[model samples]
Target: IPDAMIVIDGHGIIQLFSTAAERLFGWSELEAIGQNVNILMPEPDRSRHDSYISRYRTTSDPHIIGIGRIVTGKRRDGTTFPMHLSIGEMQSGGEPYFTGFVRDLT
Candidate 1:
């Protein structure tokens, strides 16, 4: 209900894209889900998200989980803006999964 809510598989691939997410990121559900969640990030984070998650899975380090931070996001229109994000983890379908709450700070 904030700005955006997202769900992703253990590999950082998108599983859910909320209505607010479509407006905030300029990406509709059909355009967002089944894609890597990093498609929303601006740069290195976008490219490195999968590896970052992989590393976390290996070492169990919580780099961005359960934490709030101000970061930049990329819109489907190729535009960029600031955003606030909070991420969490859980088990779904017998496998680990990630969910995020995003607030447009632009």
Candidate 2:
């Protein structure tokens, strides 16, 4: 399977959704843009994602940033899949951005 890419702002709003991600997750860029990154996660993950960001901001620790781990992904049709996710952090115009690289486990 091809790797998928997704970018989100400090507030967790999705800013970029690659064609690979669109095809993998069944969400078009038009539909994913401006939505919280949590939309791409299952229920438990969806509820916890905001806390992940909040914790990172509070501690300034790059726990999830620049790290790769297995995670569950949610498709537009509500199905779930497993994937390896690597997150990279960047700053532009003094704001933080996160880019995630995903490899499907299937």
Best by lDDT: 2
Give the alpha carbon lDDT tens digit for every residue of 2-103 in model 1.
668999999988889999999998889987888998888878888888898899899988877876788899998889999888888899779998888998
lDDT (CA) per prediction: 0.87, 0.90
> How many residue pairs clash per model?
0, 0
lDDT of 2 by residue, 25-52 (tens): 9999999999999999998879989899
User: How much is the lDDT of residue 51 in candidate 2?
Assistant: 90
C-alpha TM-scores of all predictions = 0.93, 0.93
Which residue pairs overlap in candidate 1's backbone? none
Candidate 1 structure, TM-score to reference: 0.93
Candidate 2 regions off by >4 Å?
Answer: none
